[PDB]
Design a protein around this ligand. Structure first.
Ligand SMILES: Nc1ccn([C@@H]2O[C@H](COP(=O)(O)OP(=O)(O)O)[C@@H](O)[C@H]2O)c(=O)n1
Ligand SMILES: Nc1ccn([C@@H]2O[C@H](COP(=O)(O)OP(=O)(O)O)[C@@H](O)[C@H]2O)c(=O)n1
Ligand SMILES: [Cl-]
Ligand SMILES: [Mg+2]
Ligand SMILES: [Mg+2]
Ligand code: NA
Lengths: 228, 231
């Protein structure tokens, strides 16, 4: 039987790389990640607003500081057990992405509530969760659970602006010292359905490919590397 | 420190037998069984609306493979933000590979290349079968790489028919009955309403209620279910 799924933490998702109304939020996550923050943080916002990025960045920071993190993408609740939450309070940072994937589920709600209390009781670290709505609007039912969420810090992420994506791309390319012609950036942006996560995955592949082949990112080179 | 993996667990009650026999899926299910058993089917792409049964059927295919002691691997591609295309390499050890929600990366050129390459490796010899699920047909899901769409259509493609919404009570009662649990109509309706008619949540709760009923030697009643589920 299959016991696990290999996962990885993208190395370009850090607090620095995040495209800059989000300041207090970052400081709270950094503090949590370092052992100096609140016991519970709840981050919410619309799809593609950067919830996963920021969770990844918190885990990255905790790892930097030789602190142990555990990440759960709760969107895949159909293939995992509430038993997974047991003993996680032994970690310095526990992150549950898309915790609202199980909103209204009596068994998951009780298990998560129990985890909140165990993390609090251990006093070593923090639980960070993300959702697409506030605690009182995401559909959580267990009143005690909603209380734990509401009593921690709660941050709303503002939506990413579609017309700011090119600026975000050129910034991320610059931070890599990757030369990206403006028009090639615009091509890539619009060929990737204007999806930043796809774009940034591609940017990483092109950065490596450019080094390997000692070539500039031209249209012919990008088409060849991406099979476009 | 660094996290290398996420524990997962195939639900034991999601089999071909437990599936509610919604009309219109006999051919698809026969194909899934063949792929799971190694009886000849090499690749299946099944698609349908949310809650139609795609993950259940993938789980059932894995369950069937596991009972035959065939090696299966399940990838929920919805979590692509936390996995690498490198995961698709080295799966040569497997009799069955399942990619749930493969359309999560539709249009992503690196994932499309990697998936195309996986199709080729699976199709190269009889050993190994691939099952993938999506919310739309290979074209309508927005896969871009022409070679990938061609490979998907070299395999079998099926639209999954969901059950009728009005059949959810019958589905709940049937799965409870198959485990020896009588689920009365009033309790079934109360729970359907209370859980927003989400069958996955309800099926998860019926298991706790089965044990509660046996331990206390009590029929399910609305008051009893409220107590046991912290409602
Ligand atoms: N302020 C932001 C927001 C998102 N992003 C990027 O936008 C993409 C989508 O972010 P995400 O997967 O974290 O979004 P959600 O988890 O909120 O749906 C990723 O590539 C992020 O790195 C960014 O760089 N800066
Ligand atoms: N014909 C069906 C379809 C779904 N189901 C169940 O309905 C719930 C939702 O199915 P699923 O998670 O496989 O749905 P999707 O993956 O299609 O979104 C699960 O509990 C399934 O076991 C069923 O019992 N019989
Ligand atoms: Cl591959
Ligand atoms: Mg996310
Ligand atoms: Mg599913
Ligand atoms: Na094969």
């Amino acid at each position: 039987l299959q016991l696990s799924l290999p996962v990885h933490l993208p190395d370009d998702e850090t607090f620095t790389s995040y495209y800059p109304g989000n300041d207090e939020l970052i400081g709270a996550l950094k503090s949590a990640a370092s052992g100096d923050g609140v016991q519970a943080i709840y981050l919410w916002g619309p799809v593609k607003s950067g919830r996963t990025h920021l969770i990844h960045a918190a885990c990255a920071r905790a790892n930097e500081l030789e602190r142990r993190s555990f990440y759960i993408p709760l969107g895949i609740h159909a293939s995992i057990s509430t038993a997974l939450l047991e003993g996680l309070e032994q970690f310095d940072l526990i992150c549950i992405d898309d915790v609202d994937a199980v909103a209204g589920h009596p068994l998951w709600e009780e298990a998560i509530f129990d985890l909140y209390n165990r993390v609090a009781e251990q006093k070593r670290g923090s639980l960070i969760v993300s959702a697409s709505a506030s605690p009182m609007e995401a559909g959580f039912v267990l009143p005690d659970l909603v209380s734990r969420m509401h009593w921690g810090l709660t941050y709303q992420l503002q939506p990413m602006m579609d017309d700011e994506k090119l600026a975000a791309l050129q910034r991320r390319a610059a931070m890599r010292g990757l030369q990206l012609p403006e028009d090639v950036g615009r091509f890539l942006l619009n060929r990737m359905a204007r999806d930043l996560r796809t774009l940034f995955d591609v940017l990483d592949r092109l950065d490596k490919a450019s080094m390997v082949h000692q070539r500039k990112l031209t249209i012919p080179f990008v088409k060849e590397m991406l099979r476009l």
